Structure formats: structure tokens, C-alpha cells
Amino acid sequence: DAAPIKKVSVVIPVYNEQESLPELIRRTTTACESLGKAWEILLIDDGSSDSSAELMVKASQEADSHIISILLNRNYGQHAAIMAGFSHVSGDLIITLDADLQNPPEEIPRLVAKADEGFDVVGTVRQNRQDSLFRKSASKIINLLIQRTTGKAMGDYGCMLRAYRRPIIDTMLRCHERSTFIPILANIFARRATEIPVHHAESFMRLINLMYDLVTCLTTTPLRLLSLLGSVIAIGGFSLSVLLIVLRLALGPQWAAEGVFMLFAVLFTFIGAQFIGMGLLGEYIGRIYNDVRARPRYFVQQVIYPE
Amino acid sequence: MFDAAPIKKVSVVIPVYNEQESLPELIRRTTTACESLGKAWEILLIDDGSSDSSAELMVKASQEADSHIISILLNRNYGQHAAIMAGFSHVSGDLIITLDADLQNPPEEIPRLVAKADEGFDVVGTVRQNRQDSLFRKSASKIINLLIQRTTGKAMGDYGCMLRAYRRPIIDTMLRCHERSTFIPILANIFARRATEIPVHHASFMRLINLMYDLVTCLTTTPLRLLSLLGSVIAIGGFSLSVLLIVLRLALGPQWAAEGVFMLFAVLFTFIGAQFIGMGLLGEYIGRIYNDVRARPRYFVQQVIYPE
Amino acid sequence: DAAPIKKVSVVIPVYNEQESLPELIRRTTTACESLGKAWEILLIDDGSSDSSAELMVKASQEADSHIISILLNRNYGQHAAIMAGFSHVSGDLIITLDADLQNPPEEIPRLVAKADEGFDVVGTVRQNRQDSLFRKSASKIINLLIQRTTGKAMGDYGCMLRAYRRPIIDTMLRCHERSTFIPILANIFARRATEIPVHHAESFMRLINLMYDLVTCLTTTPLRLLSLLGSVIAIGGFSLSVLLIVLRLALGPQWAAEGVFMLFAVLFTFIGAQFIGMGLLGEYIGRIYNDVRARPRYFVQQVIYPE
Amino acid sequence: MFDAAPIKKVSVVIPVYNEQESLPELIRRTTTACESLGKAWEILLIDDGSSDSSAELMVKASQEADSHIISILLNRNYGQHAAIMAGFSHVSGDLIITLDADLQNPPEEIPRLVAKADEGFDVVGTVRQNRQDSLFRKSASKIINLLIQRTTGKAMGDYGCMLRAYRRPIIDTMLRCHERSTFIPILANIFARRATEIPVHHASFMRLINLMYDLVTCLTTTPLRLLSLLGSVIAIGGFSLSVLLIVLRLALGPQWAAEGVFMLFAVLFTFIGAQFIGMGLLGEYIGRIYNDVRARPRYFVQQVIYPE
DSSP, rough: OOOOOOOEEEEESSOOOOTTTHHHHHHHHHHHHHHHHEEEEEEEEOOOSSSSSHHHHHHHHEEEEEEEEESSEEEEEEEHHHHHHHHOOSEEEEOOOOOOOSSSSSGHHHHHHHHTTSSSSEEESSSSSSOHHHHHHHHHHHHHHHHHHHSSOOOOSOOOOOOOOOOHHHHHHHHOOOSSSSSHHHHOOOOSEEEEOOOOOOOOOHHHHHHHHHHHHOSSSSHHHHHHHHHHHHHHHHHHIIIIIIHHHOOOOOTTSSSHHHHHHHHHEEEEEHHHHHHHHHHHHHHHHHHTTTTSSEEEEEOOOOO | OOOOOOOOOEEEEEEESSSSTTTTHHHHHHHHHHHHHHSSSEEEEOOOOSSTTTTHHHHHHHHHHOOOEEEEEEEEEOOHHHHHHHHTTOOOOSSSOOOOOOSSOOGGGHHHHHHHHHTTOOOEEESSSSSSOOHHHHHHHHHHHHHHHHHOOOOOOOOOOOOOEEHHHHHHHHHOOSSSSSHHHHHHHHHOOEEOOOEEEEOOOOHHHHHHHHHHHHHOSTHHHHHHHHHHHHHHHHHHHHHHHHOOOOOSSOSSSSSSHHHHHHHHHHHHHHHHHHHHHHHHHHHHHHHHOOOOOOEEEEEOOOOO | OOOOOEEEEEEEEEEEEETTTTHHHHHHHHHHTTSSSEEEEEEOHHHHHHHHHHHHHHHHHHHOEEEEEEEEEEOOHHHHHHHHHHHTSSSSSSOOOOSSSSOOGGGHHHHHHHTTTSSSSEEEEESSSOOOOOHHHHHHHHHHHHHHHHSSOOEEEEEEEEEHHHHHHHHHSSSSSOOOOOOHHHHHOSSSEEEEEEOOOOOOOHHHHHHHHHHHHOOOOHHHHHHHHHHHHHHHHHHIIIIIIIIIIHTTTTTTTTSSHHHHHHHHHHHHHHEEEEEEEHHHHHHHHHHHTTOSSOOOOEEOOOO | OOOOOOEEEEEEEEEESSOTTTTTHHHHHHHHHHHHTTTTEEEEEOSSSSSSTHHHHHHHHSSTTOOOEEEEEEEEEEHHHHHHHHTTTTTTTTTTEOOOOOOOOSSSGGGHHHHHHHOOOSSSEEESOOOOOOOHHHHHHHHHHHHHHHHHSOOOOOOOOEEEEEEHHHHHHTTTTTSSSOOOHHHHHHOOOSSSEEEEEOOOOHHHHHHHHHHHHOOOOOOOHHHHHHHHHHHHHHHHHHHHHHTSSSOOOSSSSSSHHHHHHHHHHHHHHHHHHHHHHHHHHHHHHHHHOOOOOOOOOOEEEOOH
């Protein structure tokens, strides 16, 4: 059971897209007109160096237009532009769309219908996605990680053609997390989420940076793993210490030498102590990071009090 | 302080996760025990996003005529702690009993807790007897008991079983704590005036390390303090020895093996001590931050008397 | 310029003082009556095991009495009892007093007069304090640390006979800091603070714990010192590494040996790297700790706009 | 984006701390420069808890007939940054100029900044020419310039002098940042659209380390990331070498010196790598916490156009 959707706000972050902006505006206008609802398109200029801002202003200033141009003084990123657009939306359902026509605007009605069934978040999965197998492995491993963390299974993450209900946008704006990935945050705050299949027209350090960013946004489990591996390495260090100095010194004084072995067996327990301390610091940092975000402890779905 | 309020209603909180195999037997036994109590009772079954037909059984049990069962369905799995907290958020009785859903703790022990809660105890835990296990696990349980005794003061031995009784003020105070992934019995013992235990008869190493890491955050906010002391002596000797071998002895003190090797030893130990002191300072500041962010309530006011 | 003081609330944390409550209540009642203002005494029972709670209740239930008894279900500490009392005060000026008659209640009027001059906080310094010289060393070093940190010079800290204005109490209750020492917090939030001299009737691990607690509450300077000393130790480690293996290897191969010197000069640079990393973590932790507390950046005392 | 607003009022912010020796000359020179500007002007003198008679001089200057001086007195010392922020909280002009109170930067350079701010620059910094110092200090200044160029993008060379010009929107955005003990020019460059510098002619190693530690928090939130990579290689080799010396070679591979010594060597670098990776993970989580707690504004909206 969900409130009926009366207005759709399309948020499009624009950055140096002067050659695609007219076609995007025309296609998005046609798609939104083919809805039978109040609609508006929020174009956000992320400090474009080209004539994108002039085209946005001309589109906004046209006769009987539904386009809102939000100009940022400089470049801030897709996330900051999308949140700036979220801060100015007025519709019941907010659709995030690519500005480079990778995701066709004609898929917009299909999302809206799916949002009418009572889904807070309606993601899209791109069919027949052709790319390197390494990115495919990354896609499946991040899918499994998000499924185990947030519960709601999310497939394609690079496609930001998504639908959110207004309460989800309001919660995300009022949330204590700032740099977190918006689809992940929506899945975290979603009551009911789903996905639909869509058809898409078209380094290595960046991939590792994205992996670290997503793992840190989702869970603190890696901190617990660090603590556990630190405990294990510390136990190994104490075992090597007792084995090397205490036993082999009693067995062979000359064999275990005078210089190198014994006091560095003593060194090995100090590295174990350092690992245990770092694990305790990690535990406390994880608790702090969980508490500051103040994500909901649970969502009750239905309570069935008897007669 | 002013004695204890009489117990009029008992709320049983049972977190359920994929327990369709034993759910009917659990419901029947818990209903029989609560009917034998002789007070108003209710059973809060919480579905923690079960994949099986547990939710359907809970709905059928709640919808049955003249039933005292409340079904709380969660959209997905959040864990036993989150399900128990969700159940706490919906209780209405004076005494709240947490019970296992896998029939490890027999529901027929419920009256014995309630009678103990009638003596004026805020928390009534259970300790399992005839528990056969490794002596190592028993030693671990005993040392955890001793640590919690030293920390919270209240006498509370066994934490393996979650069959426990809390008074409504303790539950209300715990609900005001927005800590995520805490340990419920420790939090109860923090705000409890008089806690006790009763004996019950029930039917790896990485786990112990995980439990120790979980409990250490709940018990104290600054373990690394001790490490700083352990660092300081390693620094002081690491300095006191170092100069003593050269600053006193240049040409008279090459000694039998090597003075340079023992300088490597001493300066390395001094660096180890400095590293320990740094970790202690980091821990101090992190503990302060954690205590401020946790925002746990500082006290529980029992009664305020205003003059006429 | 300050608002006039019309009501005085005395907050007295009580813990196992059943032999002191009658005399303390009588003397505090006489002192508060000798004021010509509305007064009230908040006695807080910190889970006393003796008959203290019964005496507090009898005092509160007497004819035309001004005593409020706040009973805590168990022991929580002097700080928690004082904050519980602060949560229930109603007067303009709040006076914290010892329950064991160490600070005579007859000093209460002298504080109130000093609070009438327009001071937010009026502390007391104990004269002719006879004790071990080591406590004197601790007293002066903590005085200098508090003076350099909070600006307002504060002497005796063990004497909690203090006066606070109601806005200071409200700010302390609404503050984000929880376990901080109350006189230090009052000096931090005070606009104008002062001290008056008073006459008082009468291990080692605890002292170092209190030193660590006060240093951590006041400043993050020790974190910067840790970073600086870590940088210095790291530079020393790199210097020792280059000196011991790189140079002495080329000078004497047999003299500098094979096992113990070379590889472990290589160890020394990793020790320095660990120190630098720990210092950088400390810098970020200090920034977090400063930002979460959200202490005021400045207090403007007077603005003198021209004609 | 839509060109730049005209400049109608200039506010000069001067943090004062025990500067009674040069305060009258500074006031006279700044008044002359601002009168020569040809716009509405005001001088905000901020007394940062001076122990000398600086406050009395500022009060006399503010109380003088037909004076454009605003005296803001602070009860105690809070630092130059807090005094400058307090001055920012009271400005009313379109362009805000921060100026040294010790006459290191001549006030006669004020018009040259304003004219540059008339070309449409949000931030107009100053770089000092004919600056004679150690080549080491010059290299430090240049590498800091390069790091800030790579981080914030805006071209901003010299940060030693605080003689700078900011547009009112930049000051307003900076006031919405509740960060404590940040670096003001870096924060301005973060929100600035077009920043520039002009040349001016002005009249230890622990310091450099302190400045680097101060700037590293403002520039990035996760330096330790790189250390984690440096750890990972030390781990992988620390593993790859270790087994290769024994798991391949038991009796054929004692080798010339010692296989056990090289085992201690290899497992030691394995532990060092693990420690680096742990410090990297701690840094990642601490950086996330710091970024969330800082709550810096994510963007500055320049104009919103609504359709008719």
C-alpha cells in the first residue's frame, strides 16, 4: 500500500554535454508528456566549460516549458549535482537519468508504472552488456556484497537511471552520510525495492578505489576481519617467539646463535601486541562509524495484533 | 528504591528466523506456560525475514480466536539483536521475557523466572546446569563471567542462553540507547538495580575471539590504556639500557659479542615503546569520541519527591 | 551586564552520607534562608546502600520545606548524579556543593554576591590546603594546562563548591560532550568566570588516569605532539637505515656482517613508515574529535559599530 | 556563471593581537587606501584577547567622528583563524579583504586586489616577490603550491601572506562550514569559480612538518590509501619469497649463510605488510567518519531558472 504518484521530477546532471543536450531534452519531454501526469525536468550544470549552460537557460526560458535549470558555480561531481537537483525537486517520484543518452529516456514510463505498484526504489539492469570479463566479475562480486549487506538484491550499479519515491529522497537529503553512493543509500532506506530490465544504446586504480569506497560505505565487516586476522597473526607471533627463543635456546645455545634469533623472537611478540591493539582500535572505529551514520535498526513490515 | 512494582502483565519476545519446523510446538508450550502463570500474558513473535513459511505460521497463530500472540514481520533479515529490539519497541507488559525460538530453553522455565521477578529483581538471568563441553569453553565462560562481574558489578554468569527476564523500566531505558550492535544483557545490567540468576536444565577458537572482540567494546571504552603503560616501561628501559652500553662504555665496552648489535636492540625497543604509547593516545581519543557518539543515558531516576 | 538572579538551586550529590545529612541539611537551609532570595536544595541519591534515601525523603516531606529528593535506582557516579540534579533545577543560579561538609555551606552567600556582579561561573580556591607536595605539583600543572587551553585561569579542581548561571547549565545539558569534567566544561562555555578564596574544614594509578582524562578532555595538542615526535623518530629511522646498511655495507662488507645489520636497517625504515601513518591517523582522529564536540569557535565580547 | 556582480562595498578584516605598536599607522594607511578605492568601505578590527592597550586604541578609532572602523572585541585569545571567522560573521561589503595587522603586507596594495576582483575573480591571492630565503623553504613553498594545484585545481601559489580578497558568496559559503581549525584559503579555493593571484612587494624544519600535517587534513581525507598499496606488495613478496626458500628448498637449500634468518626476514616483512594494510583500512574508515562529521556543503548553486 503506497500513496498515489501525481508528479514526476527528472533529475539530469549535465557536464559538458552540449552536443547531446538538445536531443536529450526533446526525447525526455516526449517521454514525460506520454505519462498523463504533472512532470518537470531538473537540468543541473556541474560547472560545464562549454555552451551547456546557455542551452539549459534557453530550454528553461521557452514558452510553456517544464524545465528547471540549476547552475553550479564550478564542477562538484555527479553526486553533488544529483544531490543539488534533489534539493530542488517538487514531484512525488524522482527519476535520475544519464545526460549522455546511454539510457534511453523512453524507458521512463516503464519505471513510473513499476513505481505505481508500490515500490520505493525501481532500479534498472542493463541487458546484453558487452564489456571486459574483469568488469563482469566486479559486477557480480559487488552484486553479492550489496545483496548480503542491504538485503535488497541490486544488479547493475553503473546505470543511474533509477526511480525513487519522495520520502526516500527526503531521507537521503536529511541523512548523516554525505559521500555514500546514492543507489546504495536508496536501497538501504527503501521499504520495497525492485529492478527492471532495460536496453542500453552503448584504468585499474579507479576500480580498486571504487571497490574500497563501496566496501567502506556498505559494511564494517572488513574491520572485524582485520581484528580476527590480527589476532591470528598475533597468536602465530607468540607461537614463533616461544618456539624460537624459549625452546631452541634450551636445546642448542650455539645452534640458535647469539646475535639474530632470540631478541627478534622477542620482537615477534611486540608485532603481535601491535596487531591486537590495531584490532581493538578498528573495533572502536567501526562502532563509531556505525553510530554516527544512524541507519535504521530495522523496518517493521506488518504487525498483526490479535482480536 | 521504593520496593518493587507488582507484576501484572508478562510479554514474551521470541525472535524467529527460519524456525517453521518447531514453531507450532514452541507456540503451544509457551501458551501453556503463560496460561499457568496466572497473570495477563502476550507472546511477541518477530519474523526476521525468514525465507520459509514461518511468517504464514505466525500470521495464522496471531489470527486464531482468543489468541494472545502478536506477529511482527520485518521486511528482511536484520539479526537477532535487531529483531529483539523491534519486539521490545512493541511490548506492553510489566515483565519482558526473551526466549529462544529453537526450543533450546524450555518454555516451562518461564514461571520460575516470573516468581523470581516477583521478589523484586530488575533482571533475572538463567545459568544452564549439566552443560557438557570442553574445559577450555568452561574456563572461557568463567573468565567472561569474572570480567562482566568486575565491569557491571551485577552477578550474571551465563550469557549463552538469551532466556532472560527484564522489568519494563529496564526495557524502556534500553530503548533510549541508540547504540547499534550492543549486547542486551550487559546493557540491562548497566541500568539494573538488583539482578540475579536462576539455574535451568536445558535439553571454535575463532568464535571465542569474535565474542571477546564483541564484548570488549561493551565492557570498557579504553583497553589500550594498559598498553600505553606497557609501552612506557619498554621506552624507559629501552632508553636506560641504550646509553648505558655506549654513553658509559666506548672502548672498554665492546664486550664479548657486539655493542652495536645491542644498540640496534635498544633503539628498536625504544621505537616499539613509542609505538605502544602512540597507540594508547589514539585509543584514548577514539574512546572519548565513541563515548560521546554513543550518547548512552547517564542515569535512571527512580523517584523524585517534591516538597509541598 | 547580566540578568538579575532571583532563585538559587543547590545541587548536592549524596552517596552513603547518612551521618552527614542532618547537619548538612540544617546548615544549607540556614545559609539559603540568609540570602533574601527564593531557594531550593536538590539532594540526589546515587544508589546509597545506607539510610541516606530515607533521610532525604523525610527532609523533602517536612512542612514548608524547599528540598527536592531525586532517587537514582543504582550508583552512577558524582558526574551522573550532578547532571541528574542539573536536569531538575529551576533556579537562576545553581550551586554545586559537597555532601560530606568539606566545603562549609556558609560560603554559599559569598558565591551568590559574586554571581550578582555578572559572572557566569564563580569557582572557589581552597586556602592553606595541607597535603602531599606531589598533589601540589599536579595542582599547578593542571592549573597551567587549563589556563593555556580554556583561557580562564582555574585553580583548585577537587573543590566542586561552584556557582553556575542557568544558561551555562542549559548549555552543558544540551552539549555533545558527556563524560567531561563539569568545572572544565563550565569554564569552556563561560562568558565571564572568576574565583574566590574559601576555607576548608579538611593511590597513584588514579592520579595518572585523571591526568589522561583531563588532557584528553581539554585539548588535542598531544595528538599533534605524537605526529611531530613520530615524524622525528621516522627521520631518525631513515637516517639510521641509510647510515647502517647503505654506507657501512660499501665501507666494510665483513665488518657490517650479513644477517643482523643490513636487513634490519631495512626494518628501521618500515618502523618510521608505521610512525608516520600513526601520526596521520592521529591528525584525522583529532579533527573528528574537535568537530563532534562542536565547542564554540569564539565568543564576541563587545562590537562597537561607529556612527 | 552569469558574469560577476559589481563591487559596491569593500570590507577589510584585520585580526589584532598585541599590535598596539603599529596599530595607529596601520589604521591611517588602511584608511588612506580605502578612501583611494572610490567605493564604500569599512575596516573590521578584531581584538583576539590582546593583553596590551590594543583594545583601547581600536575603541578610540571606532568612536572617532565619521569613521568606518568596526571594533569586535573577543573575551580571550582564540587564534588568528577564529578571529578572522568572527570578522567574516560581521562583514557587510561585497568584497572582503584579509590583511596582516603587523604591516608585513602594505595596505597600499588593497586597490590592486580590488581592480583584479573587478575583472570577475572570486578569489584574488597575493604572491610575494623578491622574497629572500633558503632554497629549501622555496622548494617547500613550490611543492605545497603543486599539491594544492593538484587538489583544488585553482592556481594559488603563496599562502604565507593572508592578504587576500574573497567575494561575498565565498565568505557566506565558508561561514556555513562548521569545520574547526581549517585553512581559509584552501576552503575558499574549494568553492571558488575563478581564482587568481597578483604579485606584491613586501617590506625551522619543525615548522614545515607542522604545516604539512595541518595541510594534509584539508587537502585529502585518505592518504593512508597509498600506504595500503605499499603494504600489499610487501605482503605479496613477503609471501612469495618465504615459501620459495623452504617450501621449495628443505635440504638442498640451506644456502651459504642461513635459511632460518631469511625465514625471519620474510615472515617479518609479511607482518609489516599486514600492519600497513590494517593501517590503510583504519585510515579509510576514519576518513569516511571525518568526511561525514565535517558536513562541508557539497556544492554552491549559482542561479536557478524556473520556467514561466
